[PDB]
Each structure stands twice: as structure tokens, then as C-alpha cells.
Amino acid sequence: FLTKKDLIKALVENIDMDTSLILEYCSTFQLDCDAVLQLFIETLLHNTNAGQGQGDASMDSAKRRHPKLLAKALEMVPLLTSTKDLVISLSGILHKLDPYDYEMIEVVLKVI
Amino acid sequence: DEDNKLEVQKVSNTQYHEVMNLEPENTLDQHSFSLPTCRISESVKKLM
């Protein structure tokens, strides 16, 4: 079961997952919930950051995602216990974000 | 008989403390191996 971390990436890539599912999966195999949740948020924002650039029509596909992204991101924040590292990594990503991606800034600063 | 306890006392000599400190969270569906509440005739119980 020490190798059960290998699925953690494969689970996170899916957009539609329950948070309690991840919590119980981590609790069953004795895994830290905070690191998995912060990685889930990092990948949730990075996928939309990696979902752009597919032509000029990616803006319309991302604009509908952004409110859902923020809505799903806000709910897991109280579930963490130590967000200091998550906030530091989020600040680094924000410094790595595009200046003309103001929705990314809106969701990142609101999560912070 | 006690003659088969030669291989038993060699097992009941280990002292462990790292096991009682860890409770596995594994679950089982134990509803498929019990007997639900019912009313049986006393004759059947006496026969058993």
C-alpha cells in the first residue's frame, strides 16, 4: 500500500471528483490529506493553464470553467490544516501567471 | 492434548507494542455471514 500514491496523480487529472472521496482514499491508506489537496488545487489551475493555447477559441472554453474552478476551489480550503506551503506555491504560480490572464489572478488572489 | 502445545508456546512468547498503536481502517461487509433477528419455534431450539 505504500505504492498507492501512484494513483494520486491519475485521480487528480479528472475534473469531476468528490472531495470526501479523496479524503477517505487518503485516510484508508494513511496518506496526508493536506499535500494531496494542495497538489489537487495546483493541478486544477495548471490544467486550465495548460488547456489554453489551443487556438483562438480557448478563451471561450476557459471562461465557463473559471467560475466553476473558483467554486470548487473555495470549498476545500477550510478542509486543509496547513496552507502555508500551498499559499507559497500559489504565489509562485501567480508570479508565473500571464499578465493578460486576469481571471487566473482573480481566482488565485481570492483563494489566497 | 498438551503434546501439541510444543509448537504453540513458541508463538505465545512475542512482545509487541507497534501493533496495538495502529488500527487498520479496513472494513468488511459482515451482514452476509450472520443471522438476522427472527422468531424461531422453541421445539427447533430444543432439538438443536
Q: Is residue A51 within 8 Å of residue A61, measured between CB atoms?
A: yes
User: Residues 6 or more apart from A46 whose CB is under 8 A from it?
Assistant: A93
CB atoms closer than 10 angstroms to residue A66: 14
Picking from A58, A26, A53, the residue whose alpha carbon sits closest to that of residue A40 is A26
Task: Check CB contact of A61 with chain B, cutoff 8 Å.
Answer: no
CA distance B28 to B36: 17
Task: Check CB contact of A4 with chain B, cutoff 8 Å.
Answer: no
User: Residues 6 or more apart from A30 whose CB is under 8 A from it?
Assistant: A1
CA distance A106 to A74: 12
Task: Check CB contact of B7 with chain A, cutoff 8 Å.
Answer: no
User: Residues 6 or more apart from A61 whose CB is under 8 A from it?
Assistant: A51
Residue given cell 421445539 in the structure block: B43
Shortest Cα distance, chain B CAs vs residue A37, angstroms:
21
User: Residues 6 or more apart from A6 whose CB is under 8 A from it?
Assistant: none
CA distance A67 to A72: 9
User: Residues 6 or more apart from A66 whose CB is under 8 A from it?
Assistant: A48, A103, A106, A107
Q: What is the resolution of this structure in A?
A: 3.9
CA-CA distances (angstroms) from residue B33 to A20, A39, B27? 29, 41, 14
Which residue of chain B comes nearest to A29, CA vs CA? Answer: B25
